[PDB]
Design an enzyme around this catalytic site. Structure first.
Site, PDB file in Angstrom:
ATOM      1  CG  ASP B  46      -1.776   1.343   1.166  1.00 52.64           C
ATOM      2  OD1 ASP B  46      -1.663   2.364   1.700  1.00 52.64           O
ATOM      3  OD2 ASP B  46      -2.916   1.269   0.513  1.00 52.64           O
ATOM      4  CE1 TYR B  51       0.746   5.641   1.948  1.00 52.85           C
ATOM      5  CE2 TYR B  51       0.021   7.816   2.786  1.00 52.85           C
ATOM      6  CZ  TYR B  51       0.015   6.410   2.336  1.00 52.85           C
ATOM      7  OH  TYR B  51      -1.278   6.037   3.082  1.00 52.85           O
ATOM      8  CE  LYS B  80      -4.103   4.669   0.867  1.00 49.10           C
ATOM      9  NZ  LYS B  80      -2.628   4.349   1.047  1.00 49.10           N
ATOM     10  CG  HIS B 113      -5.152   9.550   0.753  1.00 45.15           C
ATOM     11  ND1 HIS B 113      -3.631   9.766   0.597  1.00 45.15           N
ATOM     12  CD2 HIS B 113      -5.048   9.204   1.785  1.00 45.15           C
ATOM     13  CE1 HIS B 113      -2.946   9.075   1.478  1.00 45.15           C
ATOM     14  NE2 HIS B 113      -3.972   9.035   2.341  1.00 45.15           N
TER      15      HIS B 113
HETATM   16  N1  NAP Z   1      -5.354   5.815   3.778  1.00 40.92           N
HETATM   17  C1  NAP Z   1      -4.714   6.642   4.959  1.00 40.92           C
HETATM   18  O1  NAP Z   1      -5.342   7.581   5.404  1.00 40.92           O
HETATM   19  C2  NAP Z   1      -3.789   5.828   5.728  1.00 40.92           C
HETATM   20  C3  NAP Z   1      -3.232   6.561   6.982  1.00 40.92           C
HETATM   21  C4  NAP Z   1      -2.264   6.119   7.625  1.00 40.92           C
HETATM   22  C5  NAP Z   1      -1.597   4.772   7.485  1.00 40.92           C
HETATM   23  N2  NAP Z   1      -2.103   4.267   5.950  1.00 40.92           N
HETATM   24  C6  NAP Z   1      -1.339   2.923   5.536  1.00 40.92           C
HETATM   25  O2  NAP Z   1      -1.201   1.990   6.737  1.00 40.92           O
HETATM   26  C7  NAP Z   1       0.114   1.856   6.727  1.00 40.92           C
HETATM   27  C8  NAP Z   1       0.370   1.299   8.159  1.00 40.92           C
HETATM   28  O3  NAP Z   1       0.575   2.386   8.974  1.00 40.92           O
HETATM   29  P1  NAP Z   1       0.051   2.629  10.265  1.00 40.92           P
HETATM   30  O4  NAP Z   1       0.552   3.986  10.836  1.00 40.92           O
HETATM   31  O5  NAP Z   1      -1.436   2.458  10.297  1.00 40.92           O
HETATM   32  O6  NAP Z   1       0.763   1.832  11.267  1.00 40.92           O
HETATM   33  P2  NAP Z   1       0.485   0.333  11.880  1.00 40.92           P
HETATM   34  O7  NAP Z   1       0.486  -0.852  10.933  1.00 40.92           O
HETATM   35  O8  NAP Z   1      -0.721   0.409  12.779  1.00 40.92           O
HETATM   36  O9  NAP Z   1       1.686  -0.091  12.776  1.00 40.92           O
HETATM   37  C9  NAP Z   1       1.939   0.830  14.048  1.00 40.92           C
HETATM   38  C10 NAP Z   1       3.327   0.443  14.725  1.00 40.92           C
HETATM   39  O10 NAP Z   1       3.120  -1.255  14.738  1.00 40.92           O
HETATM   40  C11 NAP Z   1       4.759  -1.611  14.996  1.00 40.92           C
HETATM   41  N3  NAP Z   1       4.826  -2.789  14.658  1.00 40.92           N
HETATM   42  C12 NAP Z   1       4.470  -3.373  13.543  1.00 40.92           C
HETATM   43  N4  NAP Z   1       4.611  -4.690  13.539  1.00 40.92           N
HETATM   44  C13 NAP Z   1       5.052  -4.917  14.852  1.00 40.92           C
HETATM   45  C14 NAP Z   1       5.592  -6.232  15.873  1.00 40.92           C
HETATM   46  N5  NAP Z   1       5.379  -7.378  15.052  1.00 40.92           N
HETATM   47  N6  NAP Z   1       5.686  -6.095  17.132  1.00 40.92           N
HETATM   48  C15 NAP Z   1       5.691  -5.013  17.644  1.00 40.92           C
HETATM   49  N7  NAP Z   1       5.314  -3.637  16.905  1.00 40.92           N
HETATM   50  C16 NAP Z   1       5.001  -3.784  15.574  1.00 40.92           C
HETATM   51  C17 NAP Z   1       5.481  -0.487  14.177  1.00 40.92           C
HETATM   52  O11 NAP Z   1       6.674  -0.127  14.854  1.00 40.92           O
HETATM   53  P3  NAP Z   1       8.152  -0.608  14.435  1.00 40.92           P
HETATM   54  O12 NAP Z   1       8.246   0.151  13.055  1.00 40.92           O
HETATM   55  O13 NAP Z   1       9.095  -0.078  15.644  1.00 40.92           O
HETATM   56  O14 NAP Z   1       8.156  -2.123  14.287  1.00 40.92           O
HETATM   57  C18 NAP Z   1       4.620   0.726  13.863  1.00 40.92           C
HETATM   58  O15 NAP Z   1       5.164   2.009  14.159  1.00 40.92           O
HETATM   59  C19 NAP Z   1       0.959   2.838   5.857  1.00 40.92           C
HETATM   60  O16 NAP Z   1       2.048   2.374   5.761  1.00 40.92           O
HETATM   61  C20 NAP Z   1      -0.106   2.989   4.998  1.00 40.92           C
HETATM   62  O17 NAP Z   1       0.287   2.183   3.948  1.00 40.92           O
HETATM   63  C21 NAP Z   1      -3.013   4.668   5.412  1.00 40.92           C
HETATM   64  C1  FFA Z   2      -1.063  10.227   7.926  1.00 45.30           C
HETATM   65  C2  FFA Z   2      -0.675  10.045   6.385  1.00 45.30           C
HETATM   66  C3  FFA Z   2       0.295   8.974   6.267  1.00 45.30           C
HETATM   67  C4  FFA Z   2       1.651   9.665   6.843  1.00 45.30           C
HETATM   68  C5  FFA Z   2       2.221  11.058   5.843  1.00 45.30           C
HETATM   69  C6  FFA Z   2       0.710  11.803   5.877  1.00 45.30           C
HETATM   70  C7  FFA Z   2       1.046  13.200   4.865  1.00 45.30           C
HETATM   71  C8  FFA Z   2       2.582  13.878   5.252  1.00 45.30           C
HETATM   72  C9  FFA Z   2       3.372  12.824   5.477  1.00 45.30           C
HETATM   73  C10 FFA Z   2       4.714  13.323   5.108  1.00 45.30           C
HETATM   74  C11 FFA Z   2       6.000  12.420   5.113  1.00 45.30           C
HETATM   75  O1  FFA Z   2       7.007  12.807   4.640  1.00 45.30           O
HETATM   76  C12 FFA Z   2       5.894  11.216   6.035  1.00 45.30           C
HETATM   77  C13 FFA Z   2       4.370  10.487   6.073  1.00 45.30           C
HETATM   78  C14 FFA Z   2       3.358  11.802   6.414  1.00 45.30           C
HETATM   79  C15 FFA Z   2       3.426  12.024   7.924  1.00 45.30           C
HETATM   80  C16 FFA Z   2      -0.542  11.220   5.374  1.00 45.30           C
HETATM   81  C17 FFA Z   2      -1.593  11.728   5.081  1.00 45.30           C
HETATM   82  C18 FFA Z   2      -2.879  10.755   5.166  1.00 45.30           C
HETATM   83  C19 FFA Z   2      -2.185   9.519   5.736  1.00 45.30           C
HETATM   84  O2  FFA Z   2      -2.009   8.667   4.715  1.00 45.30           O
END
Ligand code: NAP
Ligand code: FFA
Ligand code: NAP
Ligand code: FFA
Lengths: 319, 319
Positions: B46, B51, B80, B113
């Site tokens: 994803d 990003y 997205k 998005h």
């Molecule tokens: N569409 C949207 O609005 C949106 C927004 C936010 C994120 N996303 C997507 O979701 C993905 C996931 O990001 P997220 O911010 O939601 O985080 P997440 O998947 O909830 O992960 C949060 C934390 O989990 C820890 N972690 C992962 N595997 C682990 C394990 N086996 N044991 C212990 N800790 C573990 C990581 O720390 P460490 O790195 O220290 O292991 C990470 O900081 C993104 O990369 C992106 O593609 C989409």
């Molecule tokens: C929070 C979210 C993922 C992390 C990014 C953020 C937009 C600004 C950003 C800029 C960066 O250089 C690192 C990630 C991030 C902080 C995104 C808005 C929607 C969601 O996907």
């Protein structure tokens, strides 16, 4: 594997091939159908001591392992102890006899075929002068303890039941000193009898509902009302099949897989064995699943009618 | 294919690796992490134009395709369109730009998005002298039509949305002339925000709920309350981890998979990326799922607070 996990940790393929054959078929037929099923990609095979096809099925499987098509560990084989061997002291002896026929060291799953004991003996259907089955009294909880011992003995990896109603399942689940919960309850299930209530019960107890009669049953003589409607001839299935560009059979199979049910199926035709594997290629919309739910009409093809009168007949209707 | 079927017939892996990284990490970090993910068995990735990691992720994927590790058809890549390109006439230009950065002929999935448009321009976060985002108003149904055209042009196999609430999904679902329903709605979901209502709605419409924040989110500065509780520190997850001989993260991931949710996950540590793949190895009991259902406390880690005044801010409604 297109597998789901049992409550004892073991994996089971969600699509299995049934090895029970119509009385009009020669027992040896089971050997060839099993080979075709394996080549088609089937890994789950359902059998029972009463089917008299275990030796033939075992020959096909052992043959496919011998030539390297599959490994024993890749095959999930199920057997069932018949009503005449439900007595606690007769359960293991029955499993060992099946293993002897199969040339196997263990079966993956062993079920109590019906919660109704019959007079012990070589005859599977002991009857009196009136042709009525001779019932016997047995403590199913004790029978279960014997099943657990078979698991601990390594003769079977998992244990379950078949044709049990939720009341009978609860008896086992609440048993004092229970060691292993049944991993499944194999019962009849299709659009005309969707078992919604029993399915929800099993799910709540981490019991997998394994369905037979998914395509209306092979309509065995002496067991099924020959005048009952043929499931696959249901207009709604025909229409939906056209809508999705599949077959009525595929619609019926997919319906159950999407409900979290492990499905069994049997066909004497090679072309249909292969076709049924296509159930993993499409998805039925949530709305059409509701349409199929509407076909429910309490049509039980295999009521085990010759067992009526038995204290433990499992098919009484709900209040 | 540990996959599920989308409403347009395409398959999507139920476990995907997210490529957004904390601002503190160099963009190139995504290349390394993506390669590790691929080696660990991840086939679903994803990303998003916002990003700033697409080119690095694309390089990792192309690198792994080049050396024979994986095939393009076995990879499911999601991108997205950001708020600044929601104008119907800018949607395709953005997708084409992403494809150029990736050097891909298509993406498997393309999402809106956020249901909130911002002033068009190179800057992803246009603000005024007060540091407030410069909002714009767009016809989201027109935006969707543009997404549909992208699917019809073969630039993306499927299309969906992200961070849409019930009313906004309805807006698209009831659109006169609608050609393709969104295949998914990617939103935040975890035990502190289980999305029971929104999940039920999506299922009823054949829309897959894809979850981020499954492990509590990477707690990005400027987006997440740094004083909010850390999800993986939740006692219930710790106790369950010990009971199943797993880890808090594995429990949280498995919880979602058993609810029919497609889960995303990100880790900067090689050991954890490999660990997460173990989610397919165990089953949580039905009783324990209910325990996890009890942790809901409406904790939204990523409320998109800087967008709070936007007319289309999605998190005001109950769901
Ligand atoms: N569409 C949207 O609005 C949106 C927004 C936010 C994120 N996303 C997507 O979701 C993905 C996931 O990001 P997220 O911010 O939601 O985080 P997440 O998947 O909830 O992960 C949060 C934390 O989990 C820890 N972690 C992962 N595997 C682990 C394990 N086996 N044991 C212990 N800790 C573990 C990581 O720390 P460490 O790195 O220290 O292991 C990470 O900081 C993104 O990369 C992106 O593609 C989409
Ligand atoms: C929070 C979210 C993922 C992390 C990014 C953020 C937009 C600004 C950003 C800029 C960066 O250089 C690192 C990630 C991030 C902080 C995104 C808005 C929607 C969601 O996907
Ligand atoms: N535990 C129990 O009490 C119990 C009881 C009965 C059966 N079973 C198990 O369930 C297995 C299945 O037996 P069943 O009686 O329930 O039958 P079933 O699977 O419901 O099949 C019913 C009929 O479907 C037809 N069929 C199969 N695939 C088809 C396709 N692609 N297109 C059109 N028709 C198709 C078959 O006819 P053709 O052969 O002509 O193709 C067959 O007669 C058994 O072998 C056994 O392992 C268990
Ligand atoms: C109906 C059921 C499957 C079909 C068999 C039946 C027992 C007698 C039989 C003997 C045969 O040679 C063919 C199959 C069958 C008619 C089984 C009793 C329980 C159920 O598995």
């Amino acid at each position: 594997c297109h597998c789901v996990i049992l409550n004892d940790g073991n994996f089971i393929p969600v699509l299995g091939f049934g090895t029970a054959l119509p009385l009009e078929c020669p027992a040896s037929k089971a050997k060839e159908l099993t080979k075709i099923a394996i080549d088609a990609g089937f890994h789950h095979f359902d059998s029972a001591s009463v089917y008299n096809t275990e030796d033939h099925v075992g020959e096909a499987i052992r043959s496919k392992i011998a030539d390297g098509t599959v490994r024993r560990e890749d095959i999930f084989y199920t057997s069932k102890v018949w009503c005449t061997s439900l007595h606690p002291e007769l359960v293991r002896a029955s499993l060992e006899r099946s293993l002897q026929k199969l040339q196997f060291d263990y079966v993956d799953l062993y079920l109590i075929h019906y919660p109704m004991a019959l007079k012990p003996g070589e005859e599977n259907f002991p009857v009196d002068e009136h042709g009525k089955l001779i019932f016997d009294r047995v403590d199913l909880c004790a029978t279960w303890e014997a099943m657990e011992k078979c698991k601990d003995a390594g003769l079977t990896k998992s244990i379950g039941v078949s044709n049990f109603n939720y009341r009978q399942l609860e008896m086992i689940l609440n048993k004092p000193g229970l060691k292993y919960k049944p991993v499944c309850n194999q019962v009849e299930c299709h659009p005309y009898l969707n078992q919604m209530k029993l399915l929800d019960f099993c799910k709540s107890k981490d019991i997998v509902l394994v369905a037979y009669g998914v395509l209306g049953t092979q309509r065995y003589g002496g067991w099924v009302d020959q005048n009952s409607p043929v499931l696959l001839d249901e207009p709604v299935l025909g229409s939906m099949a056209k809508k999705y560009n599949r077959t009525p059979a595929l619609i019926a199979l997919r319906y159950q897989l999407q409900r979290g049910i492990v499905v069994l199926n049997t066909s004497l035709k090679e072309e249909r064995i292969k076709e049924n594997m296509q159930v993993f290629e499409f998805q039925l919309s949530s709305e059409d699943m509701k349409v199929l739910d509407g076909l429910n009409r309490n049509m039980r093809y295999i009521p085990a009618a010759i067992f009526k009168g038995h204290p433990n007949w499992p098919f009484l209707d709900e209040y």
